[PDB]
Design a protein around this nucleic acid. Sequence first.
RNA 1: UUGACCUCGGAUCAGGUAGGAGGACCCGCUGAACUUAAGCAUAUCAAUAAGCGGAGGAAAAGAAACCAACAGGGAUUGCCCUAGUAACGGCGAGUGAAGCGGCAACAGCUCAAAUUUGAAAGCUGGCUUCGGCCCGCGUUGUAAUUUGGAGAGGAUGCUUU
Lengths: 58, 183, 183, 117, 74, 121, 99
Amino acid sequence: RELQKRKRRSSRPTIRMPNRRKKALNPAGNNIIAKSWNKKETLSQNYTRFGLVAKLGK
Amino acid sequence: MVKWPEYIRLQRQKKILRMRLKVPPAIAQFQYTLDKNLAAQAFKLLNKYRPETKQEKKERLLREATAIKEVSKKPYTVKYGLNHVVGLIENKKASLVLIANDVDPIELVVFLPALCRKMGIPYAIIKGKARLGTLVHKKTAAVVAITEVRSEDKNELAKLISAVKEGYLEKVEDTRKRWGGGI
Amino acid sequence: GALKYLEELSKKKQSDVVRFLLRVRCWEYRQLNVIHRASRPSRPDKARRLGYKAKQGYVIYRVRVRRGGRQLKYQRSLRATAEERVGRRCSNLRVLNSYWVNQDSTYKYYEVILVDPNHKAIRRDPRINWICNPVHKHRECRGLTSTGKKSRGLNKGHRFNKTRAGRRKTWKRHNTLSLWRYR
Amino acid sequence: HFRKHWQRRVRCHFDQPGKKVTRRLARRAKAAALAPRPVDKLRPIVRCPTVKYNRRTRLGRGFTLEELKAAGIPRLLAPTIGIAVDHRRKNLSEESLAANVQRLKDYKARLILFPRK
Amino acid sequence: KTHGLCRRCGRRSLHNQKKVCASCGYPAAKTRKYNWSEKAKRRKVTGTGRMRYLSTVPRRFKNGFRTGVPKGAR
Amino acid sequence: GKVKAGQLWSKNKEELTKILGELKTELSQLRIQKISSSGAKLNKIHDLRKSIARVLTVINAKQRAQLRLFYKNKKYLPLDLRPKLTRALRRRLSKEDASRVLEKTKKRLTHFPQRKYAVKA
Amino acid sequence: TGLTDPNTGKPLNLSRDELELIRKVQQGLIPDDVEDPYPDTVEWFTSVEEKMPLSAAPEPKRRFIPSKNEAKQIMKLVRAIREGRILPYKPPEEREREE
RNA sequence: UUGACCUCGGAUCAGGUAGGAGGACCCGCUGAACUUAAGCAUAUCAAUAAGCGGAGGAAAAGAAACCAACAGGGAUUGCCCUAGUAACGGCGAGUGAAGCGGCAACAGCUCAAAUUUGAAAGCUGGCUUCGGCCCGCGUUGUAAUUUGGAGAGGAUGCUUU
Ligand SMILES: [Zn+2]
C-alpha cells in the first residue's frame, strides 16, 4: 500500500509483465492433431471432428 | 595444584571405570586377548592373503585389458566387513575369525564370540582394530575372517586353527562366563 | 547381518550388558557439553534405519534435555526440544531425524541426524537431494519431523478427525460461513 | 450460531465464473500436451459399499491385478496406455471380475496404439 | 535528556541510561515490530524509503535473470 | 569538450590512462577559474564530467574482460565477476543435479515409457 | 581402605576421588540385596552346536563364475586403449628401461 | 627411537552456509479477559486476539496399523450434501463431527531389514596440457538388486533398449 504510492510518484517506469502462461493452450507441431486443431473450437468440439474420445468417465 | 584438560581426564577415568566396575561376562571376555606368539603366527598366514590394493588392482585390470587388445582361478583373500563376516559365520563359510577388542560401540561385537561358538567356528579376540585394518588396507577393521586358503598352505591354517582351540579357547572356557572387575 | 543382532539388543535394554553400557555412557556424556558432535552413532542400527549414511554430509549430534514437568505440561516433546536446539546450533544443516540414546534422573539424551544441503555429495544423490529444496528449511521448527508428526496427530482414522489435515486448517474451514451467488 | 466472529471468516464466491474458465482452460491446456490421448485415464466399474447404495454402481480408482491379467493387458504397460491400476482393491466375487475384464476388452477394441520411435 | 539519537532508525528514541531504542531496539538484531500497532508497521514498512536495490528486481525477472550482451554490440 | 565513446573503445590501455589524466587535470584547473564568471565554463564542466565517466567506463570494461579471459579455465571465479541473480536462485539445485535420477527409475522409463494412443468414438 | 582384587590380583592403590567415582556409578548399577545380582552365564543356547548353515537360500551362479563387474571394467579400459586415451600396460622390465 | 588408530583442540588455511526483512495466505509453540447464561464461578468467549519460532508460490497433508459390515470400497486435498444428525452437555447457556453419496483433480514411489565377496564395483576435493592423475571419505558400509496385495535365486523362451 505504502509501497504502491512510492511508485506512483517516482520517475521509474512501471514494469509491465507480459501475459505468459506456464502451460500452452493449443497443440503445436507437425503431427496430425496440430495441423487440424482449430484455435476457436473447444476441446469437445475438436475431438468430435477427429473422431476421438476426450473424457473416459461418465 | 596443576590443572588437567577435560578430555585428558575423561580418557583415564573411562579406562578405570571399564576395568574396575562389575562388568557383565560378554564385555569381560574382551579383556582376555591372545598371546604375542599366537598373534604373530596368525598374521604370518594372514599377510600372505592380503587383499589387493587400489594401485595393483588397477594394474591387473590394465594387464588383462591389454591382452584383449593384442585362465585363472578363484581369488583367495582375507574377508572383512562386519556385515559380510557375520553372514559368512552364519553360513559356516568361515574357518578362523579374528575380533578386535576395542570396538567403541562394543555392541557390534558382543554377540560375535558366542555366535562363532554356536556354529563351531574358532575365534580369537585380538588386540587392535588398527592392526586388522592394516592387514586389510583400511584405517580400521572390526572383524577379519579367513574362509578358504590356497593348497600350498592348508596345513598351516589347520595348524593355526588348532593353536587357537588349544592355546586360546581352552583357557577362556571357564572364565568367559564370569563377571569382570569387582571391588 | 550384524544389525539384526543389534535390533534385538536394543529391545532388551534393561538387561545386564545394555544397562552397563547405558550407565557408563551416561556418565561420560554428563562431563561433555550440552550439545556436542558425535563422530559415529552410539546405536548404528537405529541411525541407519532412520536414514543415516556414512557419507560426507551426514553428521550426528548428541544433546541432553532436562526432564520433568513444565501442573503445567509442555505439549512440545523432549525430542522436539532436542531437535530445535541442535538446528539453532547448526543453522546451515537440515535436521533429518532423531532417536533416544540414553537417559538419567535429570536429563534425557538424544542423537540427531543432520544432512548438509550444500555438500555436493548430498546434492547429487536423488535419495537425499529433496532436502536441498528450501521447503525443508528448519523442519524441526514446523513440526515436520517424526516427533512433530506424532504430536500433530497426522494419522489416518476417525480418532484423528480434528488434526489429520492440520488442526488449525480444520478449525478455519469449519468456522467459515460460505455464501454462494445463487442462494 | 453466530457466537464467534463470523464477520472475519465469511467467504464469498464471486470467482465462480472465473474459476470455471480456469478449470476449462486447464483441461484444454492438458489436452494440448496429450493431443491424441484422452484427458482422463480409464477407471473400473465398482459397487457402492453400504446397504443404502448397494444397488447403485460407480467408477472406482483403478483396475485390479486379476482384472488386468484376465484381459491380457500387462501390469507395467497399463499406466502407460491410459488404464488406472489399483493394488489395494480385490475382486472377491466373479461378478466384479467379469464386469471389468469386459470393460478392458472393450477398451482395447476402441484403442489405437502407435509404435515407440 | 532521557532519549538520544539512535543509529538504526534515526530517531531520538535511544534511552541514554539503558542504551536500548524505544522504536527499533538497536542492540537487538531484530527490528522492533508489534501487531497491535498497524500504524507503526506502516510507518517503517518496505516501500516507505528509497527501495534502492529491491526496485531493480522486477525488471531483471521479466528478462529471465539473463546475463550477457546483445549480439553485435560494441 | 565531449568525447564520443566510439573513439573510446578502439584505443588501448595506455592511451586511455593518458587521456583520463588529461581530462582530470583539465577538470581541476577549470574549477579554480570557474569560481569567477561561471558561464560557459560551467557548461564545460558538465561536458568534462560526462567525458570522464565515459573514459572510466571503458577502462573498467576492458579490465573486467581481461579478467574473464584469464579465469576462463579456472573454476573459482572472483565474487565481483560471478553473476548476481538472486540469493535463492544461487542456492537452487543445479540443472544437472535436479535432472539426475536413479538407475532403477531410468530402467523403468527406458523399457516402459509413456505411449502415444487414442480412443475411437 | 585397600581391598584386594576379586580375580586374585594385587592390593590396589587408587585415590579417594577414584574410589568415590566407582561408588557413584555402582549405586546407579545395583539390582538389590539378597538375591545373587551377578551370576555366571549358563550357555543354554551355545552348548548345542549348529551343524548346518542358517540360510537355506540358493547360492547364486555369480559365486562360481568370473566376475561380471570386473569384465565390464575391462571393456571400459579396452575402449580407452582403442581410442588411445589410456596408454597400454608396460611390464616392469619395460619400467627398468624407463626413468 | 619410529609409525599407525581413536579422541579432543588450534589456524587471517581453501570452499560453503545461517542471521535480517516481509509475514495477506501457511506450519508449530504459548495463551487472556470482558460478554452470554437479564446475578456468577463449570461452561461460553476461544483451542480466538496479543507474544515467540519457522517456510513457499503456495504451504500443509499424502500413498491405509484407513472406511466399512457391504453384492463392498481403496493415497492426500477442496466444494455440495450428510446436518444443526450422532455425540457431549450448571442436559441452562449451548457446543457440535464423521462414514456413505454427487463432483473438481488424479501419480505413484525411496530406504532399513541380505554376503558384490569371482575382486568398494561408489563418492568429496586438489592438480590439470581438459585427457586423466593424486589425496581423502568409506568395510562401525559408499554403488547395483529388493520394499510384503511384494520380492530373491535358478531354469526356460519370447519381448525391449
Ligand atoms: Zn532505533
